[PDB]
C-alpha cells in the first residue's frame, strides 16, 4: 500500500485516462442523461479489468514533461469515440434534408433564431439509428477497439504520426455521401411530385403551391418515409461497419507506420 504500490498505482492512471476520454466522447457512452458518476466509474471499472496485463511504467513529472504522454491517450480516445459519431451525423443529415423537401423548413429558408426542424425529423432517424447501433454489439465494439489500441499503441515516445488526422478529417466526407445514399429515393420521389405539381401551373398560374402543393407534399413525404423506414436497417449496418473499418484501419495503420 506504500509507493511500493502507490507508484505501481501509476499502472492504472494512463489506461484510465484513455478509457475516460473514449467514454466522454463516445456516441452512447457520452450521453448527457447518464449521471457523471456512472461514466467515471465505468471508466475506472473497465480499466481495473484491463489494467493487469498492461506493462506500463511512466512518470507524472512535476511541471509535466510527460504531459505529452497524457495528450496521447486523450487523443486516441478522441480518435475512437468521436469518429463513431459520423454514422449518426449521416442520418441526422439525411432525415433533415427530407424535411427540407416536404414543407417543414421554409422558416429556415428566407430569414432565424428558431430552426424548429431539428426536433421534427432528424431526431426520428437519429434515435432510430441510436437503437440500431445499440442492438448489436453497438455499445461494445468501441470498447474492444480501445483495448486493441492499448495493445497496438500502448504507451510511447512516438504516439501520433502526421498524415493520419487527414484520415479522420476527410473521412466525413462519407457523412454527406451516406446521408445522400440513404435519403436519395425519398428526395427523388418528392422531386417528381414537386415538378409535377409545378407543371400544373402551366394549365393555370393560379394553382399556388402554397395552397395546393404543401398539403400534398407533406402527406407524400410522411407516407413514403413510412414505406421506406425499413431501408435504414441495412444501411446502418454499412453506416457503422465502414466507419469501424476506418477506425480499425487507422488503429492498425499506426503501428506499422510508427
Amino acid at each position: 500500500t506504500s509507493e511500493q504500490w502507490l507508484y505501481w498505482l501509476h499502472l492504472y492512471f494512463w489506461p484510465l485516462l484513455r478509457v475516460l476520454a473514449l467514454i466522454s466522447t463516445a456516441p452512447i457512452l457520452s450521453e448527457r442523461a447518464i449521471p457523471k458518476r456512472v461514466k467515471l466509474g465505468l471508466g475506472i471499472m473497465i480499466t481495473l479489468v484491463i489494467a493487469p496485463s498492461l506493462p506500463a511504467n511512466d512518470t507524472p513529472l512535476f511541471s509535466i514533461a510527460a504531459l505529452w504522454l497524457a495528450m496521447q491517450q486523450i487523443l486516441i480516445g478522441i480518435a475512437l469515440g468521436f469518429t463513431m459519431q459520423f454514422a449518426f451525423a449521416a442520418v441526422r443529415t439525411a432525415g433533415e434534408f427530407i424535411g427540407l423537401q416536404m414543407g417543414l423548413s421554409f422558416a429556415t429558408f428566407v430569414d432565424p433564431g428558431s430552426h424548429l426542424n431539428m426536433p421534427v425529423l432528424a431526431r426520428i432517424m437519429d434515435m432510430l439509428a441510436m437503437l440500431l447501433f445499440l442492438t448489436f454489439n453497438g455499445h461494445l465494439w468501441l470498447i474492444s477497439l480501445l483495448v486493441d489500441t492499448f495493445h497496438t499503441l500502448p504507451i510511447g515516445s512516438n504516439p501520433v504520426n502526421s498524415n493520419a488526422f487527414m484520415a479522420l478529417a476527410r473521412a466525413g466526407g462519407l457523412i454527406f455521401l451516406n446521408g445522400l445514399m440513404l435519403a436519395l429515393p425519398v428526395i427523388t420521389l418528392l422531386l417528381t411530385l414537386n415538378l409535377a405539381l409545378g407543371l400544373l401551373n402551366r394549365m393555370a398560374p393560379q394553382l399556388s403551391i402554397f395552397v395546393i402543393g404543401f398539403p400534398l407534399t407533406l402527406t407524400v413525404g410522411i407516407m413514403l418515409m413510412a414505406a421506406l423506414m425499413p431501408l435504414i436497417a441495412p444501411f446502418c449496418e454499412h453506416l457503422f461497419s465502414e466507419i469501424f473499418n476506418l477506425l480499425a484501419d487507422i488503429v492498425s495503420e499506426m503501428p506499422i507506420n510508427n
Binding site: L132, A204, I212
Partner: protein, 89 residues
C-alpha cells in the same frame, strides 16, 4: 430487441402519425383544390382566396374527427408504455 423489432416500432410510429395527421392534410388539400378549380372561371385571384376556407375546413376536421384520432393516439401510447417491459427482450 432485434433490428426487426426496432424497424417495426419505427414504422408503427410513422403510421400512427399518418393516421393522426391524415384527415387534416386531406381536408386542406381538398379545400385548396376546390378553391383553385373555382379559382379560374372568373379567374379573379389576389394571392390566396383560400386560407380562410382552409381554416374553416380544418376546424370542421378537428371537430368531426376529434375523439377518434385522440383515442387512436392514446391507444398507441398506452400500448407502447405497457409493452415497454417486454420490448427489452
Amino acid at each position: 430487441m432485434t433490428p426487426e423489432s426496432v424497424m417495426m416500432m419505427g414504422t408503427e410510429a410513422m403510421k400512427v402519425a399518418l393516421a393522426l395527421a391524415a384527415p387534416l392534410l386531406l381536408v386542406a388539400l381538398i379545400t385548396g383544390l376546390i378553391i383553385s378549380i373555382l379559382q379560374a372561371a372568373t379567374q379573379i385571384n389576389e394571392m390566396t382566396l383560400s386560407f380562410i376556407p382552409k381554416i374553416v375546413a380544418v376546424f370542421i376536421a378537428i371537430i368531426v374527427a376529434g375523439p377518434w384520432m385522440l383515442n387512436l393516439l392514446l391507444d398507441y401510447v398506452r400500448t407502447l408504455f405497457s409493452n415497454l417491459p417486454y420490448i427489452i427482450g
